[PDB]
Amino acid sequence: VDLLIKLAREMDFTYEVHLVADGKFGTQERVNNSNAAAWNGMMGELLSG
Amino acid sequence: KHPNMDIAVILVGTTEEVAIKDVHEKDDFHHLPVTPRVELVTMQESDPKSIITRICDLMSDKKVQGVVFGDDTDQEAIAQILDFISVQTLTPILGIHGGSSMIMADKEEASMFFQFGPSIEQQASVMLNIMEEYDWYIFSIVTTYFPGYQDFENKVRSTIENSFVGWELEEVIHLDMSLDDIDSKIQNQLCKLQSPVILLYCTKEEATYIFEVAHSVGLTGYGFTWIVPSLVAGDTDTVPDEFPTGLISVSYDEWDYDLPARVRDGIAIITTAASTMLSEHNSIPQSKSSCNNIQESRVYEAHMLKRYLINVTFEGRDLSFSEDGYQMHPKLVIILLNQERKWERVGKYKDRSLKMWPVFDLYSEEHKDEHLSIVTLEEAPFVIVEDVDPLSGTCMRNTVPCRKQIIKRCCKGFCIDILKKIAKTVKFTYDLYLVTNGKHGKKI
Amino acid sequence: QDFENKVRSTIENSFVGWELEEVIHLDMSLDDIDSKIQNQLCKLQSPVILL
Amino acid sequence: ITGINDPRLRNPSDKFIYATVKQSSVDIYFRRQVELSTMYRHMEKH
Amino acid sequence: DPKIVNIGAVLSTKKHEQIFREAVNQANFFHFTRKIQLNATSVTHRPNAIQMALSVCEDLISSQVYAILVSHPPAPTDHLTPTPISYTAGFYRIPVIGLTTRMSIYSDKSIHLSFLRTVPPYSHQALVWFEMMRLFNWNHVILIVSDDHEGRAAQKKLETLLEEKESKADKVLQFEPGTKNLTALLLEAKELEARVIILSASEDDATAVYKSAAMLDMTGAGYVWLVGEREISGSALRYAPDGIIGLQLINGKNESAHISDAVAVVAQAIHELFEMEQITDPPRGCVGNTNIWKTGPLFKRVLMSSKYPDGVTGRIEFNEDGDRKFAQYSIMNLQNRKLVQVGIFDGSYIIQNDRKIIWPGGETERPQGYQMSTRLKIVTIHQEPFV
Numbered sequence: 001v002d003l004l005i006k007l008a009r010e011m012d013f014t015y016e017v018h019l020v021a022d023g024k025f026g027t028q029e030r031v032n033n034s035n036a037a038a039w040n041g042m043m044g045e046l047l048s049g
Numbered sequence: 050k051h052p053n054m055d056i057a058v059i060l061v062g063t064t065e066e067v068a069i070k071d072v073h074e075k076d077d078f079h080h081l082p083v084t085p086r087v088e089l090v091t092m093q094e095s096d097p098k099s100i101i102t103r104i105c106d107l108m109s110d111k112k113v114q115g116v117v118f119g120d121d122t123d124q125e126a127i128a129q130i131l132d133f134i135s136v137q138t139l140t141p142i143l144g145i146h147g148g149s150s151m152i153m154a155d156k157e158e159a160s161m162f163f164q165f166g167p168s169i170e171q172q173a174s175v176m177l178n179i180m181e182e183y184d185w186y187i188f189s190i191v192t193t194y195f196p197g198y199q200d201f202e203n204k205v206r207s208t209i210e211n212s213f214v215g216w217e218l219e220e221v222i223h224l225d226m227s228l229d230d231i232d233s234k235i236q237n238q239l240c241k242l243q244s245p246v247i248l249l250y251c252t253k254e255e256a257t258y259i260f261e262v263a264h265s266v267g268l269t270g271y272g273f274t275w276i277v278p279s280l281v282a283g284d285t286d287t288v289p290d291e292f293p294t295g296l297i298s299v300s301y302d303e304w305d306y307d308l309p310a311r312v313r314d315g316i317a318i319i320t321t322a323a324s325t326m327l328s329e330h331n332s333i334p335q336s337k338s339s340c341n342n343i344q345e346s347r348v349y350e351a352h353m354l355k356r357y358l359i360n361v362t363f364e365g366r367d368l369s370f371s372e373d374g375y376q377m378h379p380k381l382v383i384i385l386l387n388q389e390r391k392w393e394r395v396g397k398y399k400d401r402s403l404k405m406w407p408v409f410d411l412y413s414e415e416h417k418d419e420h421l422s423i424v425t426l427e428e429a430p431f432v433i434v435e436d437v438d439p440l441s442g443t444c445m446r447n448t449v450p451c452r453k454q455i456i457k458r459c460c461k462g463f464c465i466d467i468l469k470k471i472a473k474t475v476k477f478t479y480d481l482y483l484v485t486n487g488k489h490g491k492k493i
Numbered sequence: 494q495d496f497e498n499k500v501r502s503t504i505e506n507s508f509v510g511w512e513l514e515e516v517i518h519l520d521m522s523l524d525d526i527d528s529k530i531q532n533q534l535c536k537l538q539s540p541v542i543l544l
Numbered sequence: 545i546t547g548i549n550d551p552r553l554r555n556p557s558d559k560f561i562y563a564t565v566k567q568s569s570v571d572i573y574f575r576r577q578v579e580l581s582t583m584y585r586h587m588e589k590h
Numbered sequence: 591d592p593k594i595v596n597i598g599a600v601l602s603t604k605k606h607e608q609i610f611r612e613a614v615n616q617a618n619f620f621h622f623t624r625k626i627q628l629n630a631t632s633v634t635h636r637p638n639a640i641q642m643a644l645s646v647c648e649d650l651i652s653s654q655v656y657a658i659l660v661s662h663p664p665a666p667t668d669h670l671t672p673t674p675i676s677y678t679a680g681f682y683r684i685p686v687i688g689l690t691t692r693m694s695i696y697s698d699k700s701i702h703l704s705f706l707r708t709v710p711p712y713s714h715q716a717l718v719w720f721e722m723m724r725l726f727n728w729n730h731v732i733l734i735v736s737d738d739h740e741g742r743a744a745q746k747k748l749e750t751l752l753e754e755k756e757s758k759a760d761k762v763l764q765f766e767p768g769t770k771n772l773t774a775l776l777l778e779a780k781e782l783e784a785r786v787i788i789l790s791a792s793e794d795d796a797t798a799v800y801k802s803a804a805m806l807d808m809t810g811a812g813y814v815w816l817v818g819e820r821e822i823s824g825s826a827l828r829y830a831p832d833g834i835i836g837l838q839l840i841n842g843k844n845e846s847a848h849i850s851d852a853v854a855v856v857a858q859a860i861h862e863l864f865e866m867e868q869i870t871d872p873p874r875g876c877v878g879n880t881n882i883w884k885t886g887p888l889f890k891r892v893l894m895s896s897k898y899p900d901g902v903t904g905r906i907e908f909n910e911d912g913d914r915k916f917a918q919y920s921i922m923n924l925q926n927r928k929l930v931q932v933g934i935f936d937g938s939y940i941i942q943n944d945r946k947i948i949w950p951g952g953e954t955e956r957p958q959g960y961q962m963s964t965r966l967k968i969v970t971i972h973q974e975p976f977v
């Protein structure tokens with residue numbers, strides 16, 4: 001967080017933070033067909049946006 | 050009041066003109082609320098025109114609400130054709146043998162078609178169980194553009210990712226049989242792969258060409274082994290020897306249950322679905338069969354039937370289907386090409402679990418011959434017996450199976466590893482068990 | 494094989510760990526429908542070929 | 545624990561536990577890597 | 591001695607049958623008649639699939655056709671009404687060539703392995719969009735697709751185009767057909783920074799798309815719309831937003847030009863074919879033949895490679911799927927709620943017509959995209975030392 005705000009003073013950006021619903025950061029999982037779903041966890045939030 | 054359903058069944062082939070007529074349909078399980086009315090017809094050789102014409106011809110005013118198809122043929126295409134009629138009619142059709150049982154493209158959801166062949170996914174699973182049993186970890190896949198590819202590639206991918214073992218997928222090859230080759234492009238690719246265990250997927254006819262080409266490439270010989278799905282083996286009655294010997298593949302067994310028993314299963318499924326649908330809505334399933342005109346009204350209502358028909362049980366036997374229309378878990382047999390033209394059974398496989406007969410050094414090698422069974426005893430650190438995870442059902446990682454007559458125990462350790470490296474280097478296969486009387490040798 | 498032999502000595506004597514990957518002998522006689530030459534040649538993965 | 549490679553790990557025991565989080569990236573190291581692929585399963589327990 | 595090599599077709603009307611036979615005769619006259627001759631057979635579209643398939647097996651294949659041509663019927667019934675023929679000929683590997691089927695589901699060689707066409711599918715339209723995206727330098731877009739083989743194929747094609755570049759899935763949005771209200775999904779779309787949109791759907795679906803989009807005022811300026819030929823047409827045209835960018839394939843409506851050209855290609859392919867030996871005639875009649883026709887895949891191979899760049903329809907070359915390559919589309923604009931050609935696209939390069947560019951809402955020229963996001967949504971996990 002201190003790093004993030006350090007950046008925020010350095011960087012033009014503004015920040016709003018929420019912790020990911022899943023306690024896990026992320027891992028690939030779920031269904032077989034094609035490639036299905038996506039890695040559960042905050043990483044998944046990143047791809048999802 | 051009296052609810053008598055209308056049903057039709059056809060047999061093609063049978064190696065007879067005067068193919069056995071109406072052997073079945075004899076009242077069984079009459080208790081089921083709807084009684085079957087059956088019309089049986091046979092036709093000698095398959096055609097899109099003959100089949101389409103005849104099935105519509107039987108439709109007439111007759112108004113049949115169900116059809117079962119069966120064939121002596123090895124032909125892949127047939128299932129799709131009848132399926133097409135189903136898409137058009139919304140009249141249920143299924144098949145008990147041969148090509149209709151042979152896999153097909155993913156069925157249209159609105160369409161109703163069923164096959165007594167195993168699911169592609171299921172077959173891939175069985176192929177994997179077979180490789181795991183012989184502990185052949187490293188393998189490649191040769192496929193063709195025929196339908197089910199990538200359902201197969203995906204199924205293998207799913208089945209493979211989950212397992213702990215460090216198996217290797219080496220190559221996956223997709224080659225169009227169309228744009229048939231002067232280039233022997235298949236020869237040019239196939240020549241590349243170095244892997245010992247090959248899964249092939251294609252039409253019955255295609256397997257021949259791929260195999261002649263493999264014979265040119267040198268892929269059929271000496272330590273490499275091939276494993277095949279239902280389609281290539283088909284009926285198993287006719288086997289061009291273009292196929293290499295030692296070829297391993299799964300298929301439904303004729304011996305366990307004969308074709309009329311299977312037809313009985315089909316009829317039972319149709320009338321059970323009719324009985325259950327009756328119980329739910331107290332409504333006659335019977336519908337106008339004629340294809341030429343627009344599909345009969347309230348046939349659009351028929352969707353629920355499929356929904357009912359997916360899982361059906363009679364005779365203490367489950368017919369349960371999968372969304373694709375293959376039966377969820379028909380009994381299956383592991384088969385090999387015995388030397389000469391024989392298709393001789395090797396394994397039985399059912400539901401979750403698989404069982405195979407030969408112990409060691411499965412499958413006439415020019416460099417060397419026979420098989421070696423080995424006995425050991427447990428001592429730490431060198432030879433360690435461990436109890437395998439019951440949930441897994443089979444040994445994990447470095448552990449190699451060993452049996453003790455008294456139960457499967459899992460041996461791993463110094464002797465197991467030294468033996469494993471030695472087996473890898475001298476290139477032979479072996480069966481391992483545990484000693485009973487006196488462990489290490491003793492003189493009295 | 495005298496070519497092979499000369500190479501075997503020349504390559505062998507040197508300390509360096511260079512690798513001979515394949516040696517292929519194909520008869521031009523008994524000319525091929527099989528493209529047996531294609532069937533052998535396709536196999537080799539090596540960057541440098543002596544013909 | 546002598547090393548990343550510990551004979552004590554190499555000599556696993558039901559009596560001596562070695563614990564981790566499933567779906568932790570370490571688990572991805574265990575699954576993705578072939579060389580230690582045998583060793584993964586003992587960790588997977590508990 | 592002459593040898594009569596039959597061809598067969600299914601076409602909309604008897605007049606077009608006469609056009610077919612005429613083109614065939616032009617092929618005969620202009621190529622050696624001493625060695626070989628071409629003969630023409632054709633039939634009108636039948637009301638169901640079944641009458642037609644029966645027609646192929648009986649009326650056509652009994653004539654030993656070396657190939658079949660097919661066109662969309664006067665009143666389209668459902669879609670892909672030339673579905674059966676591709677299957678029916680396919681059993682014997684008899685090559686089929688569609689004139690009017692822009693449908694994408696025929697692109698997979700697996701299901702239809704005999705299918706070739708003189709028109710590119712709707713999926714291939716993405717070639718334009720990438721080029722369009724290329725010119726304007728918007729790397730950030732949004733894709734809205736219906737859920738079916740059509741939409742998913744379009745997505746795959748565009749994404750594959752993007753794969754050469756760093757893969758760009760700025761966002762992708764899937765909706766299922768026949769759904770009157772799409773509002774929530776677009777509400778999700780606005781949150782995405784990228785302000786340019788591209789969509790593929792059916793006319794009826796497109797009505798609902800524009801209807802829902804106008805409610806949230808996504809038709810406004812700072813937003814861009816790129817679309818398929820189907821979207822601009824029909825009831826969808828009525829509810830369509832201003833300043834939209836749109837596509838129309840050239841000679842898509844005409845069977846006849848495609849007839850003359852397809853038959854020309856068939857002729858070139860055959861004359862090139864008979865140069866080869868170990869040929870076999872196609873099976874005589876459906877009845878009694880359970881076996882494929884070994885030549886058919888070869889006929890397909892030459893026919894896909896068959897050049898003859900000069901044609902009534904434009905350049906002709908075939909992609910791997912048997913789909914046409916280097917086809918030309920005419921870009922369309924919605925100016926004053928009417929269709930106008932802002933430019934025309936031919937070959938791999940777009941061409942700009944003299945007409946002024948229009949963007950949605952009022953713009954003399956306004957290529958605006960992506961905005962910028964002034965906010966960062968940050969995510970974390972509960973880890974004791976760093977959080």
Ligand SMILES: C[C@@H](CN1CCC(Cc2ccccc2)CC1)[C@@H](O)c1ccc(O)cc1
Pocket residue numbers: 097126129130131133193194195196225226227252643676677678680681699700701702703704
């Ligand atoms: C799947 C087959 C075509 N397939 C669909 C049509 C069917 C014949 C039919 C006729 C009338 C009604 C229904 C069906 C025959 C089989 C083909 O694409 C293929 C075969 C093998 C292959 O590696 C790649 C593609």
Ligand SMILES: *[C@@H]1O[C@H](CO)[C@@H](O)[C@H](O)[C@H]1NC(C)=O
Pocket residue numbers: 594595596629630631653654
């Ligand atoms: C040529 O086409 C006509 C149909 O117009 C047909 O009667 C005739 O048999 C065909 N000739 C051959 C050799 O197929």
